[PDB]
Chains A and B, each alone.
Chain A
Amino acid sequence: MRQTFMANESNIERKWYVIDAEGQTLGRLSSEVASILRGKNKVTYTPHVDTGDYVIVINASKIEFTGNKETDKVYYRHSNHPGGIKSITAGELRRTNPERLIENSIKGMLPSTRLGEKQGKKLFVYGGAEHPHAAQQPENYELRG
């Protein structure tokens, strides 16, 4: 073993960003975002800890889908009782609890680890154009699209 910089809870910095969701598609977004939250795109990356950033996401509802998968992209959970399958909703979930949609769409691009589930809590989505979290002096951010 030899020299190389590692990163601790105290050698750290974390930030809070804004991202416009409107006029944008779901794949590109979730990929780039969890390429932030994962701690990647920082030269202090050390994966036995969390250099996970924070992100704010605004106006989820105006996100859009190409082709069908407006409606023919079904989401499935199971209620752990027998015959308790639920196709109960589809891409219309954009209509109702759209924040839930994104927040699951990103938390599948992350692992199931204890860390990975800690990162996903550092996301805050808002289908409405307001947020309470302006206390953090948050920034805007420009995606590459």
Chain B
Amino acid sequence: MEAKAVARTIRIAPRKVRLVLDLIRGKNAAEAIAILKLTNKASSPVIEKVLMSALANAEHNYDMNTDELVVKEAYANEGPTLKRFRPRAQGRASAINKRTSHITIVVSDGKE
């Protein structure tokens, strides 16, 4: 059928996450769990949680099975932007952007 799950205000930029997604989009679940769960980065824990969480809600609420579950689409969008500033020479400043994110996964089975 359809299924999804979300994470919001996650304290990572979009891009660094977006690469990791481009290792995902199209696969089957089990594989993608593995793919995330091995690569040594900071996003892999998070996406792993959100993915398996999505399978959780799909299982409990919608009563699916796990074989045919595939990643229909996934994408991360921009979030609030905690402006900071690091000092710098000659009496000046420079405003860092501590970025955020809103991760979106939509697990699907494809059938009814």
* Direct contact between the two chains A and B in their complex (CB within 8 A): no
